[PDB]
Nucleic acid binder design. Structure first.
Ligand code: ZN
Ligand code: ZN
Ligand code: ZN
Ligand code: ZN
Ligand code: ZN
Lengths: 74, 70
DNA sequence: GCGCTATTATCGCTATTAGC
DNA sequence: GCTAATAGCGATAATAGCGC
């Protein structure tokens, strides 16, 4: 009866086995120890949808600033 | 009908404290940025995200047209 | 770097609500 | 009275991370 349980801590803290604060997008542990941008988290099954949404919202936002920027250029 | 528990706690099947802007369950697990509450029915929301999908496609197409014309 | 235990988090099942 | 729908518990699988 395995449970598909994915760690919420970041890969580095997990690999190093240290305390993870879980800060996004990069945790304070990684930042405090000089590997901030090496910090990332595993995708959660129950987060996929909420992620798809956040990202999609960001894309419409940036794509629109882009249409405006391009137009406001040529 | 519109659920009172944030979508994540719903999917996680845990009790939501329904605190805003983000509940403590999401907060504590580090996913507060993904914590949100529904403002409309599931049908209304699904339809909204469907239109977003299409508008997105049309945008990516417009940017190509625009830049690939610059 | 990792072993070992404390604490956490998944998912089947139960309790409760909504509806016929 | 009964079946579906939604919420949410809780047993236990499995991580978190202290401390060596
Ligand atoms: Zn971390
Ligand atoms: Zn970075
Ligand atoms: Zn990190
Ligand atoms: Zn919640
Ligand atoms: Zn939440």
């Amino acid at each position: 009866r395995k449970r598909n349980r994915i760690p919420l801590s970041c890969t580095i803290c997990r690999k190093r086995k240290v305390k993870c604060d879980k800060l996004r997008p990069h945790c304070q542990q990684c930042t405090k120890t000089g590997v901030a941008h090496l910090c990332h988290y595993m995708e959660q099954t129950w987060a996929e949808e909420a992620e798809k949404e956040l990202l999609k919202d960001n894309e419409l936002k940036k794509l629109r600033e882009r249409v405006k920027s391009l137009e406001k250029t040529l």
